Design a protein around this ligand. Structure first.
Ligand SMILES: Cc1cc2nc3c(=O)[nH]c(=O)nc-3n(C[C@H](O)[C@H](O)[C@H](O)COP(=O)(O)OP(=O)(O)OC[C@H]3O[C@@H](n4cnc5c(N)ncnc54)[C@H](O)[C@@H]3O)c2cc1C
Ligand code: SF4
Ligand code: SF4
Ligand code: SF4
Lengths: 195, 195, 488, 97
């Protein structure tokens, strides 16, 4: 099988994968043992099977009389632009919300932001992101202050939440590192205990 | 988060129910699987859904545009620890046009001119604050967005006054489990039950 | 009849009988070769022309006349989808002609000058070519992709089009005068007439042409719930229906004369009535009422029908009754007026149009020619095409050292043909046009009519009467009549 | 680049050597500036200057003659249509007695 090097598209650990395929059908996924540790979870291993699904859409459809009609790409582009312009004209500024998914690449997210800017709106959002993690208001950046590569040299790791169940390759790395990992107790669910 | 998609969803819900928001653009999400969000979406005037499958949201839309999977896209993904990893396309897009192409032609209609992914990456480098250097980043190696540094806040925090902002937090009840909104994730969960 | 009435009624003298008969013989490429001798954009023109040729068709004496424009559009589209035709060019003569403006007149002049071996450059002040066919004709009537494809075909012939360049503001006309062997000004009329009433400068009142241009460029516009369009020409109809498609819940058209005296086409009026724009009649502007710089009401007087004028339309007479109309936006679409802009040393008349020597298309400045709406004011597109072609011929003759004016030809014509002379002909119903229902038209910008199929085109074209003389291209009597200046 | 004098020619040369596309607008029928219209023939041969400018033009630099900025082409045109503008007009007015 031909092999292509990509990254997993299911959570934020971002394990590198090799997609093994033959023609236009993806057949299997393997870990990337050269550039990473080479671990994967169930979602990364068995999750690309939607690429071969036969229920995927193929051409844009526009609703008329309650039924979807297949249209060309140019007609679809014209219809969406003109309907968005009509909404902007009838209801003014900030009448359009742009809801995106965090699975898209950086360039697609940037272009969606540019589209939101061009249609005279500031409402850009996501149901998954739902306002961020709240670390931005304290330190300025809503991001991790350290990289995964520094989990090897720390002498103590405190885990909050279900890190093992949700992002298990990180748990594999923590277990193989051998550092003393202590989980926050489950019977401390209210933040008065954090106080 | 880094492209500005950090508005809370409650603002979108209120703007839907207050009559201020009249149109919505959904890219890759499925909010309509839950009854309250479906009832909110039913009070719209124009809804566009970009999705791979004819999901619950795309049935109630006025226009559906297909998307391609993660095996057919070229781009970059930003890891949890601020690492930018290249995503390479294994197979050609089965619908004809990639998501980046669709957004590029729509912005071309709206009056913004982009040709290929290099122009988009240059625009990202010249407009997004911390991605400066993405133009010649060489994503085949390790690239981190804050000045290619693994550690944040080495010279002070990034707040307004370069000081950490500490604010009092109130009593907090037990955690409420989050829902899944990306269509691929719910598709994988439902397809798990098929076998 | 040396030439049929249908060809003589057309401003460009396009041989309608020849290519209708060529369609009836199944030769579509030859039909396009016939059409392209007079214009470079046959599909668009067939789509939008008000067809004066169809009014003079003698088939009217039996039943509905031949759908000439639909056949032209059908053949043009069939050739565009197939093998694109490029007419032959003479060997290059080394002369340089600059054409200002890429409208129908400028495009036609550039086409017929490049077909004579000269090198033509078009300077356009807008990002896309087409002129008022692009920024004045709405998308649901003329598809812009068709016009773009036709202009690309023209560009493939070796014509350089320079966009975003305005003559007078960015490039002086003296530059073109010094660097080129000829200049043809096809600037056209691009200024909106005001309401010509008190309080016409209030915010919230905008021109029809600027509103349509902003619609075309996909800009951010504001319309609101209630829109009042003032005017009765084609501009008022296009603005009303475009605003109906742009989310306005109710649109009102205000005019001073009767439905029977509207200058717009009856088909466009009926389509607008079906779409949902309400007509408010026998009304002229009086005063624009607004508060805090925002206009919300339009005050008007009620008129009454009077005696017909010299043009055949009943004159309005005042009645002394006042009525006010609520609105959220008011659009003035009374008409277009020619503006010369910053171009200097060009004589203009009392109405703003460029003054030219009749029949030679020469302005006061030497080496500078003009035509189109810059001369005749607002008129239909085929008039602009005809003026551009005649001016291209005159410029080509001028470049050879001897300027010859354009003069019409003499033909034998027959004017005694009546219905009793055509009682032996069989009757065949005209081909109806398939028009999309009023549900989808009101909300979308897609096409409202579909082009003829091959079967429909054959059925329509096999119905002509062949009014012209079959011996015209070899008759010697008419040859000597034209040559010796004998009136027919 | 406005003007084909030594400053304009040098700027165009060192900008085209960095991969950019450079256009020179010159108000005179021949390039050189005051090296052509101020230096006499017996001191600087004009054929030598023409050969050097032809060598520079072979690198891909378009020189447009008989075009005066401000009189024939406005500077707003160059501002809108180009990523940079370099004014090397020089001093071309004679002091009186
Ligand atoms: C609302 C509306 C409805 C119409 N309906 C019809 C219809 O039913 N049938 C029909 O046949 N026609 C219709 N027309 C079109 C119109 O009747 C003619 O087509 C018109 O004559 C266009 O030809 P033109 O020679 O004037 O070209 P123009 O459209 O005037 O072309 C002029 C071009 O020159 C450019 N230009 C202007 N000033 C300068 C300058 N200083 N320097 C350089 N370039 C410049 C302009 O940007 C434009 O590109 C309609 C137009 C409008 C606005
Ligand atoms: S832990 Fe599993 S789901 Fe997350 S990135 Fe790695 S393989 Fe993908
Ligand atoms: S351009 Fe108009 S008048 Fe001429 S043949 Fe076509 S429809 Fe008839
Ligand atoms: S019947 Fe034919 S030839 Fe006679 S006027 Fe009509 S189109 Fe022309």
């Amino acid at each position: 099988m031909d092999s292509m090097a990509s990254v997993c598209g299911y959570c934020g650990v971002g394990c590198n994968v090799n997609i093994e395929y033959k023609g236009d059908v993806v057949f299997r996924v393997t870990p990337d043992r050269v550039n990473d540790d080479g671990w994967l979870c169930q979602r990364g291993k068995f999750g690309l099977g939607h690429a071969n699904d036969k229920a995927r859409l193929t051409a844009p459809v526009i609703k008329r009389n309650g039924q979807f009609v297949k249209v060309d790409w140019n007609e679809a582009n014209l219809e969406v632009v003109k309907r968005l312009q009509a909404v902007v004209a009838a209801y003014g500024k900030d009448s359009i919300g742009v809801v995106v998914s965090p699975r898209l690449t950086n360039e697609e997210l940037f272009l969606a932001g540019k589209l939101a800017d061009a249609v005279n709106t500031t409402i850009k959002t996501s149901y998954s992101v739902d306002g961020g993690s709240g670390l931005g208001s304290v330190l300025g950046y809503d991001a991790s202050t350290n990289s995964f590569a520094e989990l090897d040299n720390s002498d103590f790791v405190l885990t909050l939440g279900k890190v093992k169940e949700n992002h298990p390759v990180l748990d594999f790395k923590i277990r193989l590192s051998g550092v003393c990992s202590v989980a926050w107790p489950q019977s401390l669910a209210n933040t008065a205990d954090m106080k | 988060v880094d492209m500005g998609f950090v508005m809370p969803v409650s603002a979108v819900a209120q703007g839907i129910e207050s009559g201020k928001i009249k149109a919505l653009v959904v890219i890759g999400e499925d909010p309509a699987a839950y009854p309250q969000e479906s009832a909110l979406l039913q009070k719209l005037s124009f809804l566009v859904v970009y999705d791979m499958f004819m999901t619950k949201t795309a049935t109630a839309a006025d226009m559906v545009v297909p998307l391609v999977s993660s095996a057919e896209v070229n781009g970059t993904y930003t890891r949890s620890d601020r690492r930018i990893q290249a995503v390479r396309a294994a197979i050609q897009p089965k619908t004809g046009k990639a998501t980046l192409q669709i957004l590029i032609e729509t912005l071309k209609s709206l009056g913004i001119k982009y040709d290929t992914i290099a122009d988009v990456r240059a625009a990202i480098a010249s407009e997004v604050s911390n991605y400066a250097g993405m133009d010649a980043a060489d994503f085949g190696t390790t690239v981190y967005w804050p000045n290619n540094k693994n550690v944040l806040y080495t010279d002070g925090f990034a707040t307004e006054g370069q000081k950490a902002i500490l604010a009092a937090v109130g009593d907090v009840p037990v955690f409420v489990e989050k829902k899944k909104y990306d269509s691929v994730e719910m598709n994988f969960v439902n397809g798990r039950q098929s076998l | 009849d040396c030439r049929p009435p249908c060809m003589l009624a057309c401003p460009a003298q396009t041989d309608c009988q020849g290519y209708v008969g060529l369609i009836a013989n199944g030769q579509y490429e030859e039909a396009l070769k016939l059409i392209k001798d007079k214009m470079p954009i046959p599909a668009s023109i067939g789509k939008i022309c008000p067809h004066p040729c169809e009014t003079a068709c003698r088939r009217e004496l039996v039943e509905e006349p031949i759908s000439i424009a639909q056949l032209k559009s059908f053949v043009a589209e069939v050739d565009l989808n197939g093998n694109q035709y490029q007419p032959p060019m003479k060997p290059a003569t080394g002369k340089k002609v600059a054409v200002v403006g890429a409208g129908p007149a400028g495009l036609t002049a550039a086409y017929f000058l490049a077909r004579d071996g000269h090198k033509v450059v078009i300077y356009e002040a807008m990002p896309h070519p087409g002129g008022m066919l692009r920024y004045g004709i709405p998308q649901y009537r003329l598809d812009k992709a068709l016009l773009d494809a036709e202009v690309a075909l023209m560009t493939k012939m070796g014509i350089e089009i320079i966009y975003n360049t305005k003559i007078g503001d960015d490039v002086s006309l003296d530059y073109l005068h010094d660097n080129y062997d000829a200049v043809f000004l096809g600037i056209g009329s691009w200024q909106s007439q005001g309401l010509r009433c008190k309080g016409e400068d209030m915010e919230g009142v905008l021109g029809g042409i600027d509103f349509l241009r902003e619609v075309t460029m996909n800009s951010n516009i504001t319309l609101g719930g209630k829109v009042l369009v003032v005017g009765g020409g084609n501009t008022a109809m296009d603005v009303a229906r475009t605003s109906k498609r742009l989310g306005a819940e109710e649109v009102t058209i205000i005019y001073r004369r009767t439905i029977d005296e509207m200058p717009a086409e009856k088909i466009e009026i009926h389509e607008a009535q079906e779409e949902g724009v309400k007509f408010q009649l026998l009304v002229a502007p009086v005063e624009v009422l607004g508060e805090n710089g925002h206009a919300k009401a339009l005050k008007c007087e009620i008129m009454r029908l009077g005696e017909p004028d010299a043009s055949g339309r009943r004159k309005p007479e005042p009645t002394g009754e006042t009525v006010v109309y609520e609105a959220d936006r008011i659009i003035a679409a009374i008409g277009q007026k020619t503006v010369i802009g910053n171009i200097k040393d060009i004589a203009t008349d009392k109405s703003g149009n460029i003054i030219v020597n009749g029949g030679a298309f020469t302005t006061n400045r030497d080496k500078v020619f003009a035509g189109g709406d810059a001369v005749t004011g607002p008129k239909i597109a085929i008039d602009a095409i005809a003026q551009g072609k005649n001016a291209a011929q005159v410029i080509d003759s001028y470049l050879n050292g001897c300027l010859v004016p354009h003069a019409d030809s003499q033909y034998f014509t027959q004017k005694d043909i009546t219905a009793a002379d055509l009682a032996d002909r069989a009757k065949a119903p005209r081909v109806s046009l398939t028009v999309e229902d009023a549900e989808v038209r009101n909300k979308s910008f897609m096409q409202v009519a579909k082009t003829f199929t091959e079967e429909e085109a054959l059925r329509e074209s096999k119905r002509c009467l062949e009014c012209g003389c079959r011996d015209y291209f070899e008759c010697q009597l008419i040859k000597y009549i034209q040559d010796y200046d004998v009136s027919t």
